[PDB]
């Protein structure tokens, strides 16, 4: 009854995706008319958005001024009447269950059974139980067992997992053995920052534009591994190393490394340094203290 860390068993789900987005195309096409191939599926699924430290959202202002009813019964069934027969053509090619699914989603009914609930393989089900016991043990502070789970798992050939935040916080709270959360993260960036879809929201990502969660969390959490101190020029040495320019958060990490190193003219250069990176961190989507507060610490320094 929980998400599975495997690529979903295939055929029928994909041909259903076909029927769905194809009919979607015909209805929305005729809709814009009335307002006036893997690749066809690709363009189709394509043109669509794919007191505490709250990474705040974008609130409501500078947005439209309503709409008034577009869709009566007669007018909708006008738009619907034709694309449903076009659908009658390839429905004849798909399977009877698939056809039924097309009929029901197109009535607007939502299917009883999940993709998992109708899925149907030994090795993958075993990996499912393995990974599950990993996540469970890591939740249970059972770092020993959890470590055994992790080693036995990574042994397997079967699936790569984005599951990466699972292992970041996993090895993090594990402390037990294996080349740790930082090693995993910098591995993620080294393998997936070069040319060398379904599964992917933001908490696991590709290094064209922002890989977010794991990177910023090893960044901050490493600066807290300096809270262990009072390592920094290391953390910002390998935050210096990568080019993935849409961050700024590593600009505030950088300027935080300079404020932490500023705690004689050397200390001056560190304070001018943080003064610089706070503005080249006004470069991008802002991380802001009132920042006259940042400067006020910097004047407590100017003492």
């Amino acid at each position: 009854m929980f998400e599975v860390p495997i690529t979903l068993t295939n055929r029928k789900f994909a041909q259903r995706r076909k029927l769905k987005y194809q009919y979607i195309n015909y209805i929305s096409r005729r809709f814009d008319r009335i307002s006036k191939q893997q690749k066809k599926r690709r363009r189709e699924r394509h043109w669509r958005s794919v007191s505490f430290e709250i990474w705040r959202t974008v609130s409501s202002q500078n947005k439209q001024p309503i709409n008034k009813q577009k869709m009566t019964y007669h007018n909708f069934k006008k738009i619907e009447k034709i694309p449903l027969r076009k659908m009658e053509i390839p429905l004849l090619h798909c399977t009877k269950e698939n056809k039924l699914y097309f009929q029901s989603i197109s009535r607007g009914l939502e299917p009883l059974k999940t993709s998992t609930s109708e899925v149907r393989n030994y090795r993958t089900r075993h990996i499912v139980t393995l990974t599950d016991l990993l996540h469970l043990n890591v939740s249970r502070h059972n770092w020993s067992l959890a470590y055994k789970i992790f080693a036995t798992l990574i042994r397997i050939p079967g699936v790569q997992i984005k599951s990466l935040w699972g292992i970041g916080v996993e090895i993090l709270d594990n402390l037990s053995n294996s080349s740790s959360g930082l090693d995993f993260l910098q591995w993620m960036c080294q393998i997936y920052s070069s040319k060398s879809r379904s599964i992917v929201p933001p908490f696991q990502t590709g290094s064209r534009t922002h890989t977010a969660k794991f990177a910023i969390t090893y960044l901050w959490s490493s600066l807290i591994n300096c809270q262990k101190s009072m390592l920094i020029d290391k953390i910002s040495e390998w935050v210096l190393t990568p080019p993935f320019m849409e961050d700024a958060e590593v600009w505030f990490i950088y300027a935080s490394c300079h404020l932490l190193k500023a705690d004689i003219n050397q200390v001056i250069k560190h304070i001018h340094y943080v003064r610089t990176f706070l503005k080249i961190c006004l470069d991008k989507g802002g991380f802001a203290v009132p920042s006259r507060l940042i400067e006020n610490q910097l004047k407590s320094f100017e003492s």
């Binding site: 009854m1 393989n121 030994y122 090795r123 089900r125 075993h126 990996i127 139980t129 393995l130 016991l133 469970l136 249970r140 059972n142 067992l145 470590y147 055994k148 789970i149 992790f150 080693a151 036995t152 990574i154 042994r155 397997i156 050939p157 079967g158 053995n177 294996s178 080349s179 090693d183 591995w187 393998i191």
Partner: protein, 63 residues
């Protein structure tokens, strides 16, 4: 016992609920002997960077 542990292993690939809710109501030792049977009998699996994953996996002990 060997038997009931087995029946749990069959419960995992039985098509219908409840039996999977039955795996839900199992206990840390059942899960443990499970991962054991996973690393033993899911070596009967099916189907540069490769050595990078021999060192990569050899980063954390296989035991």
């Amino acid at each position: 016992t060997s038997e009931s542990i087995g029946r749990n292993i069959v419960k995992v690939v039985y098509p219908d609920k409840p039996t999977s809710s039955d795996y839900f109501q199992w206990s840390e030792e059942e899960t443990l002997e499970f991962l054991k049977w996973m690393e033993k009998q899911f070596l009967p699996t099916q189907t540069d960077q490769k050595i990078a994953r021999r060192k990569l996996y050899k980063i954390f002990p296989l035991d």
